[PDB]
Structures are given as structure tokens and as C-alpha cells.
Amino acid sequence: MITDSLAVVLQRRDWENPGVTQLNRLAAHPPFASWRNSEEARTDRPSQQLRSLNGEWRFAWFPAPEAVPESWLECDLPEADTVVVPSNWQMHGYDAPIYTNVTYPITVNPPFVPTENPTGCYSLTFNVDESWLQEGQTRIIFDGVNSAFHLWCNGRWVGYGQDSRLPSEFDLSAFLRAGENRLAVMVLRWSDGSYLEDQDMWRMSGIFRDVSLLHKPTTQISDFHVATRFNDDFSRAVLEAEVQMCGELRDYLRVTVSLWQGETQVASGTAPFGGEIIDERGGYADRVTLRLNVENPKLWSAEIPNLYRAVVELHTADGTLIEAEACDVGFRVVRIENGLLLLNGKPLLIRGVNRHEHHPLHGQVMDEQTMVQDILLMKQNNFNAVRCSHYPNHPLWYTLCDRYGLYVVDEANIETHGMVPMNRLTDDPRWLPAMSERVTRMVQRDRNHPSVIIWSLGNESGHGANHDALYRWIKSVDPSRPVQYEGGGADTTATDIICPMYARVDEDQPFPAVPKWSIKKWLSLPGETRPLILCEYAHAMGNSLGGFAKYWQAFRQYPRLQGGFVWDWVDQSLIKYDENGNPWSAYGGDFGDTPNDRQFCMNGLVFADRTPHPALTEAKHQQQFFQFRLSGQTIEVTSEYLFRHSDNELLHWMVALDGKPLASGEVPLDVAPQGKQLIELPELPQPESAGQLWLTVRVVQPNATAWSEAGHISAWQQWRLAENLSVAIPHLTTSEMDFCIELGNKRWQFNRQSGFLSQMWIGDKKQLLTPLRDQFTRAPLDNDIGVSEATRIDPNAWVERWKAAGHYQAEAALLQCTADTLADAVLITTAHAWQHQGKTLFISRKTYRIDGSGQMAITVDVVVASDTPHPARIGLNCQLAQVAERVNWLGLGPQENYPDRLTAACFDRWDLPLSDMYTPYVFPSENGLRCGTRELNYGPHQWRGDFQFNISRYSQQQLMETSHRHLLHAEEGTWLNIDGFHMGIGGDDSWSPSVSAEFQLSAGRYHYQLVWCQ
Amino acid sequence: MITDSLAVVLQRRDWENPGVTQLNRLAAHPPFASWRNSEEARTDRPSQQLRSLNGEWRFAWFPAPEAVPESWLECDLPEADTVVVPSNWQMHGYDAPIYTNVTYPITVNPPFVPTENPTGCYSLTFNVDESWLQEGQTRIIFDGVNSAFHLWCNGRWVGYGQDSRLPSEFDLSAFLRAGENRLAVMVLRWSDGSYLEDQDMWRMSGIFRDVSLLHKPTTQISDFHVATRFNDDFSRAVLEAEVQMCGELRDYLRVTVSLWQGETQVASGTAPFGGEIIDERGGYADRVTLRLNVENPKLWSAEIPNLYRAVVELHTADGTLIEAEACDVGFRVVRIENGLLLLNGKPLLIRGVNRHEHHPLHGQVMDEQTMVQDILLMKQNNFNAVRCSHYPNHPLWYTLCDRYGLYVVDEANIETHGMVPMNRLTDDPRWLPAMSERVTRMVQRDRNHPSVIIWSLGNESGHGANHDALYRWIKSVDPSRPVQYEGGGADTTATDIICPMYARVDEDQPFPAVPKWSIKKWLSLPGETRPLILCEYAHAMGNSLGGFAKYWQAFRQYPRLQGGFVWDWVDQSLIKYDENGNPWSAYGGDFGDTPNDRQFCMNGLVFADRTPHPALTEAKHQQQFFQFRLSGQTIEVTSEYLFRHSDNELLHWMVALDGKPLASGEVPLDVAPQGKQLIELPELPQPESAGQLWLTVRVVQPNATAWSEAGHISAWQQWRLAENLSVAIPHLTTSEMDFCIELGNKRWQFNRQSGFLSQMWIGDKKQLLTPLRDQFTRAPLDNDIGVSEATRIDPNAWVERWKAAGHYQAEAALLQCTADTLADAVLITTAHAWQHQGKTLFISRKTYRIDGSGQMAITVDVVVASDTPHPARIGLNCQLAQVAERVNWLGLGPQENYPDRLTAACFDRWDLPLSDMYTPYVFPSENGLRCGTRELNYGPHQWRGDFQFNISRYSQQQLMETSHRHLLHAEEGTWLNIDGFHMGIGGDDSWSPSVSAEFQLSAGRYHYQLVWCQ
Ligand SMILES: [Mg+2]
Ligand SMILES: [Mg+2]
Ligand SMILES: [Mg+2]
Ligand SMILES: [Mg+2]
Ligand code: NA
Ligand code: NA
Ligand code: NA
Ligand code: NA
């Protein structure tokens, strides 16, 4: 037909009109399956009325919707490939995914999008049974289509949809025919809706969530809401189920709502349709509210995710079932009382993380297995909350969070970050309809999920009146959940929770019109009474999460600081393939996407393959649910659980002397929620030998859980106990070029022109490929770089200050190199000055004392100019000629730890393969540091003292000059960096200096001593 | 083109889709004229860039949009008539206007409308100058089109619009061509928008407001808001003018905002574009806010409508004017403080009325002359506020209210009264977009008008979440005005003001879920702190406004009772024409409209021709701005003005004895706002003659005003002063049939079978056409009938109770008729029983004493059964044979007054033509009563006593059995009803019993005496 033709359908350009967000789309509603059997519904068995169209579809790509041929509406194109649906077509190579953070991927001219609008033409030929078309309603459900789409069925135009992150449903009953049918879906990458979808993520497109057919009866359940009300002590609950119907009303129709705990019916209710009178015209004849009483309900929480099963049966008075829907019900109350967010009467402490729907191979297509993997890892690392950054998630997500026990912030798909000002659209009433659909349809879909405890109005869209309106709309329709929104300063009228992004613990960031106060200060501002939960904090970009412990100290000290959501869970890297077929991880700009925000897509605690970064352990430790205090030999264990007794926890303790165990034991934990348990340690040993005693306690979960295996370690702490302080002569040969010291089969060679230990021999085997030289620089971290780019320098970034000061180009100048034979040792004294453009940045004065035992004692005293940027490190580095399989050390470990991220590390004797001493951050940087190290063993070498170290096959130079980890090549031998001092890594944010003063190397004078021996 | 064709344009049926409220419509904005001269703008002179297309258009009517021929898009139809635009096409006879109140005029199946959808095809061929199309933007403005419409220009489809009551603007620049152009407008009577337009009014359609062309420059003023901020005492003001631009930004662009008081520039400000930073992305580069200081501003109020002129000039830095817009600015603050609505720091007392846009000949087309007439009448009757029931009004309205001084409630065009429940749509998020457009676009249009002091979210649409959302939206965008909304119980979260409809003063109406408490009680409900202003009260349907004084006593006694809006200003009657070309007033059902709400369209204080009903005077008296208290000979005059001194008022006083003046005088009023003035009266006379002294004071405005002529009476009061109490024999001839009494040339004849005075002779001329008989009934008022209809009886209505009790059918039974000659008089004693179906309702026992002076003294004692409904009246009626030109009476007058509506009437000697004793209510009923009457003179007849009376050419029977006033025919002679007692008329509402107990004839025994003589 003429009006079904592309030429007509496309003429109005509905994808460039925010007044048209949909055409012929059905109302939003909770998940439906149209069970015709109540036991199936109760048991969540797969309904035959819900059919999946996921699988092999036909796909053709076009540069613009105009280029689509009319024949596509009737027959599959010859040029059409077979592709899997759901999928993003950028993952199939048709065009490039674009990583941009704030800047829109298109020209900013709303509501218009580029004429070159990549278009994906999907089609599916399928069979429909005669019974479906004989009676009832057959709808098609698109759980996600990015960004917009037109839908044809058998050549006839059905409808149009936007909002990539919520389901779009269309009635096909009048379009289907018994037997073979063809769907034709034209998906546009850009639409007016794209102005509300400016999230900091990969910009992709396609039918990336499930496609289904649902068959319902003519007389059907159209919507149903569950609410739970409680008494003062949660001993009595009322489940209020409001059920709505569509179709023909009849006095024999009945609704039965039954509530099940496993196989046990705990409550039930039956009633005819017809609600109570609500205004002068009457009530809803097509609605009914059942009120079921539940005595001593088992309450839902992230700690104990007790769930009931609500089955909603639409049937006849004589008992014939018309259809059945069902939901998981969690009995919990979420409310803000006197400035505190309470769940079931107790103040929450949100151990949260932001999570994008990202898969390195399938992009933004989510599968159950990846969701479960994420949830398990999160709970195993002491997360209890997740923020749907920044859009409604795949439906299954919420179910899993109901089942496994995670608190969820459900967020509308509204982000206009790229607008100038940020609220240009959100303050414009012409965009209120569009925004409304993104909020309302989210609530209507997800309001029955107990896991969802907070609604969010979106992200980074300023503060406009549309936010206030939709805030109030949510509050009116669902007063069971707080609403939050960070835009416009994080404390606007459109949020019940002060929810700033990257507000620091103690440091104010007074930005014009939207300051980021210190969270502590923020709570106390005149007139402010709300709780404060950071929607984003602790930016985990690369080697980061420095200063995380400061946040958690504050969270625990301040009642109204109820936590936050780390940014973020998983790196948004994508897999590309080398010429040799090898996969490597790619970030912004690696797909020809331009402009792009290069590696800012990788802010995760875990790699895209869900392998953890070191920072994750820090989080786990700071978020652990058991806090410990040592008093003498008494351990006070305090529980931060609100609801569960410690019924699956035992405390293992161990006392060790310089890594050697001396005593241990196990004590079952029996501590009530928010309670204390005192554990008296038996008299620990009094080792008369020298060294520091260390007490380490670990809470172990002996039995498996739904989310953890037996023996899971959930918490730990370490304290220093008592310390007992410790109470042949080398031959020197002097030449014009070097001092040579010989002792047995050991030989040291100091170059007199450079002033450095230039070679060491054991027997005849050289030990150094590069001299032992002072190092004051590190391969910059993403936090060091910030947003600085070779084209657009950011002068306040640490890397730019270091480069401008000449730290990387500083030329060592020999001031002194002298040798002297003592009674039993040889003493080499050196002094160097590092200079740049006439200024002396650093002066190092060293002494090397080589004694009759072969031990070389190195004393290093460094002066740092007060006016030069504080150096990243003060230490030594050399390239060792040997490559050994393993690294042994007495120090903090086992994982990478830095001065502002080492609380989770434990002091012990650690022994790891050399590879585990390199952290493969996709963007290479300084990595692998271990701090608090008293002994390091590598090959025949032993270093002793009190130092930090990293050891790898990659130089700091190579790390600094290589953009991707897959481009690194192991160099000859092994690079050893031994630092007396190392700067913090930061992480409060990764676009401004974030290293706190106490972790900057600002003392001006530094001293450290090493002992190097065989 | 194919896509411009009706077949394509109409295929999507945008008028049955609430997701499509418009296509290609431009943003809403304040009134624009695009002056290219700043003096013109200042002087509000007509801009040549604003051209009117009002005038002769071509029009063709069709029963459905499908029936429109494609040729219409290119050339005018042959069948097309020439019609005036603006117009409603029901007023041109093409189809019928439908009067329905609650029930939708279409089948209720949203969003769908009937397939038979009357369609009006308008077209206009006009000329466009070349300059308009050479550069700049040419838009077409439709200030009102009911209900929806598609727009073509020169055969090409431009756009689509809904919301009949706000302007719809479209850019024609790309469609126009130098010289001759043709607009084609297809207007649909029904659309999805019609579900939001269920106001209790005539349902009409067409282009009923102005159509204009506006030419603006490419670089233009796109929006501008004015705000006024004040200090604690309103001595200093800041005018904050936010100006927005569209087009190309350039650093030489400037905005100048100048403020004028007549010809005097009081303030000015210039600035480049670029607003302050508002969020992280910056500010609005295309906006600028000027902040002008005004010292000692002249404040705007309904009492003193001081206005400034704001001229907004968009120009270059070097001084070239690009364009100029302008507005009237009123400096006033509206805010609710501690439960009180304050204007400029003073609590308002709203003397309000609801006003529909209605004209009896042109329907819903409004002209300036009618608006001015209405405003003048309102102010002359002591109204200071108007509610735009129930939609945004013609723009000019607001301007006039700014100029003349009326407070305005601006109301969104949202009424869903016919839905079941009433909030079915307003609680549905799918209708939130549509509703939003009706609210937002109202605010954007009218927010600069000082007269608008309150926003309303609509009317009779229940309470749904959409209301809460839009309430909050208004509060966010314009916090300068309170928002009110009555739906959902009048005290919901969506209103700042308790704004009930027809809540009574002392009587509760406990309806389920939406009770109408007594307003006094309502204020004091636990937790209630808001002010209470009735959005509708005192239903002026016909002979009504009984009990109005109770409302105003309450308003004055209770601070938080700040008044209300009477329902309503003007009868919504329409003019039809008899076979003889005579015009008559018509109401529901007179156009074949069915179903219809017959006469409920006529609820006005004035007739459709703006002739006043009697009730208006009552309102004027109760709303008067001067209150009086008498103490001895001292009059305390209290001013209820808040802002103005009584600078144009003098008090005239007069003392009169039984209507004869004895003394008078004038005293200038000099009373401050809310102040008191004591006026000592000189020693009033001590007339030793008999009778009651009456003091009457009137406030006269000696000088003309913009709204009143010289000598205007604005207030009055009357008190009783001292009273000095007053300290030939007829021949009887008895026959079997009658007693005959003769005295000189006077003869009385009493029938002994009936027991009534059956004839009276003066000389040989009979005086009676009908005997003098007791009357206990009245032709029912609309308040007596309520909603009762012959098909659907309402048993609690007074008329139905009276009919069921037999009051109208009661048969008089003679119990006694006897005659007796006294010393100097003849005494006739009678006793009658009125009976129905065996029950005696009334018993009348009378004595007629005819003495030697010709005077017939009648004593009447009536017993009323306690269990029969209280009778409407207790009196006598006769048909007098004579017709005299005038009626003289000593009593309350001059206008119709009833026991619960007589405060405004004054006791005096009144003399009016007989016609003025009949009030021509379009729906006939009891009318013309004058109460407190001590003397009545008609022809040679004089009646004396203390009675109420009406006198007319129409019997109560005829009034009762005639549906329209034009169908009344004067009967032979004159019907006189003399009542000892008369029931109240009611009026709190006209669909339930509203006569308060103290005005019901419930005493069971009544006595009254008359003296009838020559
Ligand atoms: Mg659109
Ligand atoms: Mg962003
Ligand atoms: Mg529509
Ligand atoms: Mg109504
Ligand atoms: Na806290
Ligand atoms: Na990022
Ligand atoms: Na009052
Ligand atoms: Na009415």
C-alpha cells in the first residue's frame, strides 16, 4: 500500500521530532508471560504463550534510511547477511562503534540528526500457529532497539519506537496470518532520542535485546502493582496487589492473588472487579485491589534475599483460568527518616558500584551468564548495591538482584551531558514528553522488583523543570522508593538524596553554580537534612582507587554518609584482532572513531573479561562487613550486617614472625547484626629472636552460598604485635674509568664518569644490563595524565607539571665520586645533581659500603627543590640481566599496592610468578608496586631494607611510550625499581589532581637505605 | 505531492492519538508583534509585521475528513461559501452546537472519536509582499481552532495542531511565494484532545479566534520573561527581564530593556548575550538577563492598576534596531504566607466570578467590545477577580484585565469530567504529554501578565499523578504565582489553595472520597493550613443566589476564607429565530442536540446580552468595599480596600418615614485602606406621626473612572431608626349560593360552595377574573427542580417532593363558610382543607371583616401538616381584571428580592412599570417577588400589611408549564400573588436541595393579615 511504503513512512521523519517518541506502541507494564496454568506461573516455568524470536535474522546495512529499497518491505534483499539477534551491528563490522564521553557523536542541532544516519534493516520470516490468530492478542516485544525504529509486518507498517533501553510492544493481531509471516525492522542509529542518550559509553546500535512474541487472551491482565505495608516492628505485613484488566468486563470475572513461600501458600485473596470510589464519577470498574495479610513475613534484603511468589490469576467465578501472571515479591520498606535512608527500619550503608551493560565481544548485548558472573563477583567483593548507569537494564538483571540480594538504583535513560548548558533540553517543556516516557515507562516496568530501592531521573542533564515534574510524578505514583538525581549540583529539589559525583571526603571543589563540597561539609550546610550517597566516586580508571579508605572511614563515622557507588564495575574495552588473529583490548579511537575519548571508557574494577584489577581487593577490604579492633590479646569483632546473624562465619587468626607462622587457631563468629564479639587470643608466643610479630585475622565462610564457594574469605585485618629490634676485606682497584671492588667471586664496578654502580659479577656472569641509577619518575598513570592530550595540554595534570619541570628529561650531573678502604669494607661515596634548563631539581648523595661479607649497603639521601613539582618516586632502578620465574618478598602483598592503596594488602612472605608482578592495564602505566617491603629475593639477589618495589620485563620508558598493553614487548632481563618513597596514585577523579597532600613527596629531604647481597 | 495529499496526511489519524498533539508547531511564547521601531512598541501602535487574516474565508462542511476531495488542496471547491473568520460554524448553520455538561458529546472510547467527525475546510487566498519572503521568517498564528486541524499552504502540508484554546504557530517561510498564496485548513470537531475539553459549555468548532501572519527577522527575540522582586516594604523593586534569541549569534548583538511610565523612562539596561553559568557545561549563550532597579514603584492591583511599559530591543552594538517586543508590566507580588494569599503584602478578599467566553450570536468568538462590557459591568458590581473557566482566554482579555484592574486565574484547557473515574486520563502517563502541552504552553504565553495572579491546572479531571507533575512544573518555572486545582477533593497536593466547588458555609456534604466540607470546618481540619478560595460557588442558575450573604459574612469573619468565584458571569444561551423572524434565547436541546443538559447552560448573573439578572445586585451589595455599622447617630464606615484611599467617594445619607424623605446630606469619605471613618449624623427628625424611620446611606463616586460613570453607586446600607406605633355599615344579603356585602358603590361576593371571595365590584365594573384563593405553591425554580427530569426523577428535589405530596394537585375542601353582621362591619369566616389521596396537607381558616369604610380586613391562619414537604409559599392569589401601567409599593425594592436574597434591596416607596415586576428568566419560574412590603398599590386597589408579593401577566401555572420565556403569553388581566410567607430560593448548588432551614416554611402554623381597599 502507498501509506505502508518507505517513501511515506519516512517523510515525516519521526526520528527528528521529540513530539513523536512512538507510534502505535502499547502501554508499559511489568513482565508478562500469559501463563494459562497457575502452577507454571508459580514455578516460573516457560510459557508457551511467550515465544522467542531471538536467533538468525536477515540484516542489511545502509548509510541512510533513504537508501533502503522499497522491495525490502516485501522480500529479503539479495545483499542481506544472516546475523544473530540480539546483536549490535558494530560488533559485526558494518560500521564503527564510537567512544565519546561528553561530546555528542553527532552534530549538536536538536532535534535534527545527520542525513547520513546508519540504518540497519532487520527481517525475520517466522511461523505463527493458527490458534494464536483464531482468538486473542498477539504482540511483539522489542526489549531494546538502539536508537529508533520503524516496524512493518508482512509489508504493512505497524509502528515506531524510541528509548533504546525500554521495551517497545506492538499489537500484530491485525497483521499476522496463519503460517509464514515476515517482520521488517528499520533501525536508525541516530534519532532525536539520541540527544537524551549521551552516556559516557560506546555508541552502538541495533536490536541488542530480546525480541519476543506474546499471546494473551482478549480479556487479559493489563497491569499489576504489588505494594507491601508493615507495622512498627515488621511483624505484620499487608501485600496490596492492584490488578488491572483490558477487554470485555463481565460479572463472572474474578481475580485471585496467591502468595507462596516455596511450595507453601501463605496467603490468598479473591475478588470481583471494581475498585473503591475515588472521585465524584466513581471508581475503576476494570481494577481490583487484593489486600493479603502476612504474619511474620520474611523480609527481603541484600543480606537475606527472602522472596515470595505472587501469582495473579484472572479466572471465572466458576473456576476457569483465563490467564495467570506472576512476580517475585520481596517484603521490604525503603524510606528516608530523619535524614537517613532506612531499609526495614535500619540505616543502609551502600557498598555500591556503577555497572554498564558491556561485553567485550557482544558490546551492549547482555546474557544471563555474564550477569550472574558480575553479581557473584560483586557480592564476593562485599558490594551490596548496583546503580544502573545510566539506563534501565535488561529485565533479567533485576530478577537476579532480587534473587542474589543486591540493592538496585534504577535509572531513567536520560543523559544530555553534551548540551550547553547541560539543562538546555531538560528545562525545555517541548522535551518534557520525551523525558516523561523514559521515566514513566521505567517505573511501570520495574516497580514490582524489591531489589529496586531507589529511582533515578537520569544522569548529567543539568537541572531543569522537567526533572522537578518527573520527580513529583514518581513520588505520586510510587511513594515506596526514594528518588535521586545528581544533576544541577547533586542537592536540588529533584532528589531525596544528596548524590554527588566525585565529591571528596575533606577537600572542597567550589565550582560555579554546582560546587562539589566535601561530603562531610555538604551534610552540614545550612538547611540540609538529607542523606548523602555518592552516585559516583572512586574513579577506578587504570591504576587507581587511591584514597578509598578515606571514603570508608567517613562513611562509617558519619551516619548520614551512607556510602556510594564506585565508578565503575567493568572496563568498557572491546576486542579487536591483530593481523595474526590474536585478540587485543581496544578503547576509544581504535575503530577510527573520531573525535573520541581514548581510554576513559576503561574505568572498571574488573577487566572486560571480568578478571579483577588489584583495586577490587582494596574495595573488598574497605567494604567488608566485619570491623576489627585489637586491645591487647582481645579482638573486638563488630558486625556491620543489619539483619543477619553471623551464622556462616569463623574467624581464623595467625601470629607470624617476619613471615614464619608461630601460632594460629579458629573461633566461630557468633555476633548479632550491629553487635560485638570479643575473642580472647591465647597467650601468643614471646619469640626471643629478632623481628616484628604480626597478627592476621580472616573471616572465612565455611559453607557455600548462592554467590560464594566454601572457604570464601569475606573480611580480614592485620596488626603489628610486639617487635624485638635486632641488636676477608674487599679489595679496591682504582683506574681512571672505574673503581673495581673484588671479594671472592663477587665483583662490583663503579663508573667514575657517571658515578653509578655500572656492573656486578658473580663469578664471570654479569648481573646488570643497565647501571643502578636514581629514578624520580614513573610511567604516568591515567590519574597522572587526566584529560591532558598531546594536542590539548592540561597544565595542572601531574604528568604535564613533571614534563614541564624536566623530570623525564633531567640530566644527571656527577658532583662527587670517591672511593676509600676502611678496616673491613670499601666505601664509595657519590653525589649527583639532576638538572633541567639550568635548574637543579634533585640532588642525590649516596654511600656504597661493601664489606667482607659481600653485602653492599647503599645509603641514599635526596634533596628535592621545593619549587619543582613533587616527584612521583624517589628510588633506584636497574636492568637485571637475569630472568627468574618467581619473585619472593617479605612485605605487603600479594597484590599490587601503593601508598594510598595498601590497606587490603597484608604483610607476609609472598612468592609469585614474575608475570603476577605486572598488572596488565590496557593503557600501560606504572604498575606492580609492592610497598612496606623488608626483603626482596629475585634469582640470586636479595635486597633488604624498608622500600617499595616493582619488578617486570617492561621499562618505565616503554610503559610510558606504549598506548596498548598488547604492544608491549618484554625487554632483555628484568627491570627492578626499588623506591625509598613513592607518590600516591589518586583516584577521587581522573581528570584533576587527586593525590592527597599526605601522599605527595613534599618533604624536600628523603633518606633510604638498602642492602644488596647474594 | 503524494505525501501532501489528504490520503497520506489523514492515514495516521493524528486526531486519534494523544502521542501526537502537534506537528511542526513552533514554541509557545508571549505576545509578539515584531516592531522595527522602539517608539511604536512603547506606544503599542499596530505593527506592519503583524497582519490580520481575519475576514472573508472560503468554507466547506463535510461529515468526515475522508469526504474532503483532494482538489480542495489546490483550488477552492464550487460548493464553498464565504464566511467570516473567526467564527464557529455551528453559528452559521452547518451543524448543531451541542450543550452537554458532563457526558461527553461523543462515544467514550479514548483516544478514538466517531468516524462521523464534522470537518470544516477553510481556505484563504491572500497576497504576501516580496519583502517578507526576501529575508526573515513568516509564521502563521491561529489563536484558536476547535478541536484539531491540519494546515496546508499552497498545496503543501505544513502541520497539525490541537488544544483549541491556545495559539498554534507554523513557519510558512519555506511555503509562501511572492504574490498570491492559498491556505487550506482542515478543522476537525472531534479529536483525542476533545477528551481533555469536556467543559460544561456548548460544544462548537471552527477557527473561532484570530488568524495572523507575523514577520520576524532571522535574528529575533524568541521569548522574554519579566519578573518583579521587592523589598520588605515595596519601596524598591528589581525588574528582571530574561530575553532569549533565535538565529545567528554575533558579538555585536545587544539587548536593551527599557521601562516606561507613560512618556517617562524610569529605568533601562543594556547587555550583550550570554547568561551566567548555571551548570558544568556553562550558561545560555543565547539568553541575557537585565536587572533594572525601580525606586518607589507604583504597584499594580485591581484597585489601582498601575502599569509600566517594558520595551525589549534587540539591536546592534552600533545602535541599529533589529526588532522590538513589548509588554505591560505590573509591579505586584503574589504569595501565600502563613495560610493567607497576599498581594503586595496584604491579604486578598476575592470578589470573583467565573466567566466563559460566550456570545449569544457568535458563540465562543470574543470581541474587544464584549470583553470591555463584561469588565465594566463586573467592576461596577464590585467584582475584582475573574476565573478563566475553564481554558486560556483570548489574549486581549488579559491585557484588559491588566488595564482595568481585575485579578485573573488562568486555567489550563483540561477537563475530563465525563471520564469514569474522573481521573482515568489524568492518572495515565500516556496522557501526560498532552496535558503538559496544555499547561506549559499556557504559562509560556501568559506569564508576563500582572493580572494573572494564580495558575489553574484545569477543572473536573479528578486527581492523578499528571496533576502533581504539572503542579511542580509550574512551581519550578514560575514561582511568582500560586497554583490551584480543585479536582480530587479540592485540597490535594496539586493545589496551594483549598479551592472547592459549591462547598457550603456551615453544612457538610460528606461525599465518599471527595467530601465537600463546610468551608469553616475545612479550614480547621487537622494539618490544614492553606487559604480557602472557592473556585465555584453561588450557582446563579435562574432565580438564585439565595444565601449569598452567608458566604460573605463568613469571608469577612474568617481570615483564611479569602472569597471565591461565583458561577457564573453570563448565561450561555444562544439566539434562534421564530418563524416570524423574531429572536429568542435557546438552551440545551433547542438545536436537536441530544443528549443535552437542557437549561444548565444558563447559570449567569447577566443574560447573554449582558443585561443583569436581579441576583447581580445582591452580589454587588455583599461584595461592596465599604462596610457600615450604626451606633446611635454615628455611622462607622470601614474600608475593605487594601491599597487605595477613598479619594473618589462621598457618603449620601437620607432619613425617611414610610418612604417620605425627612432629611438628607452628603459627607466626603476620607478613609484609609482597611481604615475606619466615623460620620456623626445631625440630630435626625422626631416625627410625631406614625411609622418606621429608615436611614439609608449610599457611597457615590462623584467622578468618572475608566470603568464607571460619574455618580456611580458603589455601596449602600439601610437601618431602621425609631418607630412610632400607630395608636354607613355594609349590608349583608344571604342566598343559597353566595353572601353579598354592599357598601356604597362597592360590592363583595363570597361563594358559599367554594368559600372564597369570588367577585368584587367598584360601581358596575367587576374586579376579579378568578377568585381570591389560598396558594401554597410556586412555579418551581431551577433550584427547586435540580437535575430532576420527567424521565429521570430526582426524589429529593423540592419540586418532586411537592408533586409527590400533591401540593400542585391538592383539592380545596370547604369546612366552614359563615357570615355575621357586627355593629359596624360584616364578618365572613371560612375554613378550607387541602387534601391529596386522603391526607390533609393544609388547613386555612380565614376571617373577612368588611367595615363601614369599604376596607376588607383579611386574617389568615394556616396549619401545615408536619410530615408534608414544607410549602413553597403561604399566601393568596387572584386574577385581577384590570391591567395598569405601573405598580407602586412601600417595601423592599426596587428589584426582585426573596427571603434569602433581599439584603441588597432597600425599603422605600418604589414605583415601576408592570413589566419590571416580571423577571424574564429564559426558563420561566416563580419570579418578581418583592418582600418586606407594607403597602401595594395597583390600579384602584391598595393592599396593606406585612407581606411579599409578585404581580404579573403570567400565572404560576403558565410559568410552570412553559419551557421558554418567548412562549409566554400575557393572560387576561393581572395575576397577584400576596404571600404572608415565602420559601427561600437557594443557590449553593442547583442540583441538590440548597434552601437553608431558616428559610423553609417549617413552623407548622402561620398567620398573616391583609387589608384590601380602594
Ligand atoms: Mg521522534
Ligand atoms: Mg556523561
Ligand atoms: Mg492527537
Ligand atoms: Mg464539568
Ligand atoms: Na554512615
Ligand atoms: Na568513562
Ligand atoms: Na477572610
Ligand atoms: Na452549567
Residue numbers in the entry:
A (entry chain D), B (entry chain A): 2 to 728, 736 to 1022
Sentences from the paper on this structure:
We report the determination of the structure of Escherichia coli β-galactosidase at a resolution of ∼1.8 Å using data collected on a 200 kV CRYO ARM microscope equipped with a K3 direct electron detector. In addition to the expected features such as holes in the densities of aromatic residues, the map also shows density bumps corresponding to the locations of hydrogen atoms. These findings validate the use of electron microscopes operating at 200 kV for imaging protein complexes at atomic resolution using cryo-EM.
The final resolution of the map, as assessed by the conventional Fourier shell correlation (FSC) criterion, is 1.8 Å, as judged by both the FSC value at 0.143 between random halves of the data, and the FSC value at 0.5 between the map and the atomic model derived from the map. The final atomic model has 3618 water molecules, closely comparable to the number of water molecules reported in high-resolution crystal structures of β-galactosidase. Although the map is not yet at a resolution where individual hydrogen atoms are separately resolved, these additional density bumps nevertheless allow for more accurate model building. This can be demonstrated most clearly for the cases of glutamine and asparagine residues, where the hydrogen density removes the uncertainty in the fitting of the amide groups. Our present report of a map for β-galactosidase at 1.8 Å resolution with the JEOL CRYO ARM 200 microscope shows that 200 kV instruments are adequate for high-resolution imaging of protein complexes with lower symmetry than apoferritin.
